[PDB]
C-alpha cells in the first residue's frame, strides 16, 4: 500500500487491491524478449510437467515479498533487485508464458 516500488506496483497491477499476495516477481525486460524464453532451454517445471523453459541469459528482476508485519489492508513488501535466469511455463499458440516457475 505505500511508496517503495513493490508496494506501488503490486497495487497498480491489481495484485494487492483486494488481498496481500505473499510474493510476486516483476521482470524488467521488453515483453517480446520475455516471450522469446518459450523457445529457449526446455526444463521440467517444479511440478514435473515439461513445458517450462529457462532463459539463456539473466534478466533484471525485482522480487517483492511480504514482511512478517504485513496485514490486509496494509500490505507491506521487501523489495529485492537481482539479475537472474527466469523459468516460465508456456502454453498456447502463440506459445507464450502463462506462469512464472522460478528465477535461478
Amino acid at each position: 500500500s505505500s511508496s517503495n516500488y513493490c508496494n506501488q506496483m503490486m497495487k497498480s497491477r491489481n495484485l494487492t487491491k483486494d488481498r496481500c499476495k505473499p510474493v510476486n516477481t516483476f521482470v524488467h525486460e521488453s515483453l517480446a524478449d520475455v516471450q522469446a524464453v518459450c523457445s529457449q532451454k526446455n526444463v521440467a517445471c517444479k511440478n514435473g510437467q515439461t513445458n517450462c523453459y529457462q532463459s539463456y541469459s539473466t534478466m533484471s528482476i525485482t522480487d517483492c515479498r511480504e514482511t512478517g508485519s504485513s496485514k490486509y489492508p496494509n500490505c507491506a513488501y521487501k523489495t529485492t533487485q537481482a539479475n537472474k535466469h527466469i523459468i516460465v511455463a508456456c502454453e498456447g499458440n502463440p506459445y507464450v508464458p502463462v506462469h512464472f516457475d522460478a528465477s535461478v
Binding site: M9, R13, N14, L15, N24, T25, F26, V27, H28, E29, S30, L31, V34, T62, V88, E91, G92, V96, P97, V98, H99, F100
Partner: peptide, 15 residues
C-alpha cells in the same frame, strides 16, 4: 475477460 497470458503480463512484466 483476461486470458492466462494477459494475467502473466499484468502480474509479471514491467517493460
Amino acid at each position: 475477460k483476461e486470458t492466462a497470458a494477459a494475467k502473466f503480463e499484468r502480474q509479471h512484466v514491467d517493460s
